[PDB]
Amino acid sequence: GARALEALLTVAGELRGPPLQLDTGQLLKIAKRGGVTAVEAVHAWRNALTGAPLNLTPEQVVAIASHDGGKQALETVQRLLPVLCQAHGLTPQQVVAIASHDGGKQALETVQRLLPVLCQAHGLTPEQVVAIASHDGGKQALETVQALLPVLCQAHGLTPEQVVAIASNGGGKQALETVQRLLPVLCQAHGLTPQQVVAIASNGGGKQALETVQRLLPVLCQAHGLTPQQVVAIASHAGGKQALETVQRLLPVLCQAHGLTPQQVVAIASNNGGKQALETVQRGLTPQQVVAIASHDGGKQALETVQRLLPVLCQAHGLTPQQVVAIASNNGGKQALETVQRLLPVLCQAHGLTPEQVVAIASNGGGKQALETVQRLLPVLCQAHGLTPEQVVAIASHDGGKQALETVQRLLPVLCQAHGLTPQQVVAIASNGGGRPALESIVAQLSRPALTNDHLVALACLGGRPALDAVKKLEH
DNA sequence: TGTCCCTTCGCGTCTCT
DNA sequence: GAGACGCGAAGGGACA
């Protein structure tokens, strides 16, 4: 091709126009993963996708387009969404979720073909079939659940929920076959329980982790002194294979030359990217603190960010290492640190918050999301809904802050004016892990019915959604 | 150069209490 | 607070 690059840039240009009104980020996303033909398909069928009986939002179109075969997915969605919705009960969101993976077309056609038999003959729910279908290779996983769910239940004593958990990852077919093949030897030869085998298999690359566990468990227990419980824990994240091999190679070095305990090495290895974290730790602080930063998903990123920003954050923004470590010791530590850097001065000034408050927000999983959302929503929360900034901060200061805030904004009016809860109590329910589910559950029970309104709040604060659901099950 | 499938890394949120 | 859940991005291999 040559200087019909112009034609393609003109096509991308017209997608910025209406019905989709895409921005640069979205165009970039489609180009990077769906390729030019996905970009051309979106342009070609932008009207069909957006109206008719599909009625897709541009965000939904982007999600389908942004994978290998995206053009096939968009074509097939136009063909199958209505029948999947009307005849099989699924919602459009679910159809989009199936379609938003590489090979989306195949998954959608297989769900059409297999959902009935899987529900009727195998007893799955539509929800489970969607979860199986909603990954790359979903066709294969669905077909393998159909062929193997009986043997895995009858001969290997697994539950359908377990089989679904193994199936609901990319390479689900591979993990299910490997479980079928290796479950007996892993239990009988290495002393594992089915549950443990399941936990190792229930992640992406589970096949690889099971074969690695079969291959290295002996060495790691017999020659390096780890327990089977420890080996399993390492193996129970995606990438387990990698973490297991790196443990074998680095355990002697990290204990001999650097003085870490075996239990510290394991804890670092037992996260997604464990291999990465181990290598990075081998390459201000106490070793306890380095381990603590390393011991999360993305631990490598956190450590390299800490090494880069600890000096400036301490010197130019006045923080202590103890605070930097606390920001870094969560999932996405790197993201929180970077954000705190570009958001301490801004939040304190445009919105009048103290540093100590900013640290409390960023010292949780999802810090970047919490801060960025406090920046957006603090003004409307106080001025419109009448909240104190200290209240907004109590809600932001937990894992899932952005969720709890965005939900509070949505649900604060209907909780107070329509059901007589005080804002004092809604803040109390939002100020925990799982604030958003807790609020939703609360509104659902109240909108569409002995547990008076105050008992429901005491329950929602204490145990969130779990407490609320448990209460239903238990009901007399 | 697109389409399908599989694996790994990382980020974000919720459950268990 | 630790351990569990979900999901997107990105890269690799096979085949056309």
How many angstroms separate the CA of A374 from the C1' of C3?
A: 27
Nearest nt by C1' to A131 Cα: C6
Nearest nt by C1' to A329 Cα: C1
A134-159 in b/e form (b: 16+ CB < 10 A) is: bbbbbbbbbebbbebbeebbeebebe
The total of structural domains in chain A comes to 1
Q: What is the DSSP string of A224-291?
A: T---HHHHHHHHTSTTHHHHHHHHHHHHHHHHHTS---HHHHHHHHSSTTHHHHHHHHH----HHHHH
How many angstroms separate the CA of A309 from the C1' of C15?
A: 47
Cα–Cα distances (Å) from A139 to A167, A244, A381, A419, in that order, read 11, 30, 45, 46
How many angstroms separate the CA of A87 from the C1' of C7?
A: 28
How many angstroms separate the CA of A434 from the C1' of B15?
A: 8
DSSP type of residue A219: I
Beta strands in A55-160 (DSSP E): none
A174-199 in b/e form (b: 16+ CB < 10 A) is: bbbebbbebbeebeeebebebebbbb
Nearest nt by C1' to A432 Cα: B14
Q: Is A43 helix (H, G, I), strand (E, B) or coil?
A: helix
Q: Is A68 helix (H, G, I), strand (E, B) or coil?
A: coil
Give the other-Cβ count within 10 Å of A384's Cβ: 11
Q: What resolution does the deposited structure have, in angstroms?
A: 2.5
The single residue listed with the structure tokens 């005491």 is A458
How many angstroms separate the CA of A468 from the C1' of C13?
A: 47
Nearest to A310 by CA among A279, A348, A342, A341: A341
Cβ burial of A323 (10 Å; 0-12, 13-18, 19+) is buried
Range of the domain at A346: 1-476
d(CA A166, CA A371): 35
A471 alpha-carbon distance from chain centroid? 27
Percent of chain A as helix, strand, coil, to the nearest 5: 75, 0, 25
Kindly state the helix (H) or strand (E) to which residue A187 belongs, with its residue range: helix A172-188
d(CA A162, CA A223): 32
Residues whose C-beta lies under 7 Å from strand C: A 29, 32-33, 63, 66, 68, 97, 100, 102, 131, 134, 136, 165, 168, 170, 199, 202, 204, 233, 236, 238, 267, 270, 272, 292, 297, 331, 365, 399, 433
**Single-letter amino acid code for the residue at A475:** E
Q: Which residue is nearest to nucleotide B8 (CA to C1')?
A: A239
Q: How many CA atoms lie within 13 A of A339 on its CB side?
A: 26
Cα–Cα distances (Å) from A129 to A18, A93, A119, A170, A475, in that order, read 35, 14, 8, 14, 29
Give the other-Cβ count within 10 Å of A221's Cβ: 16
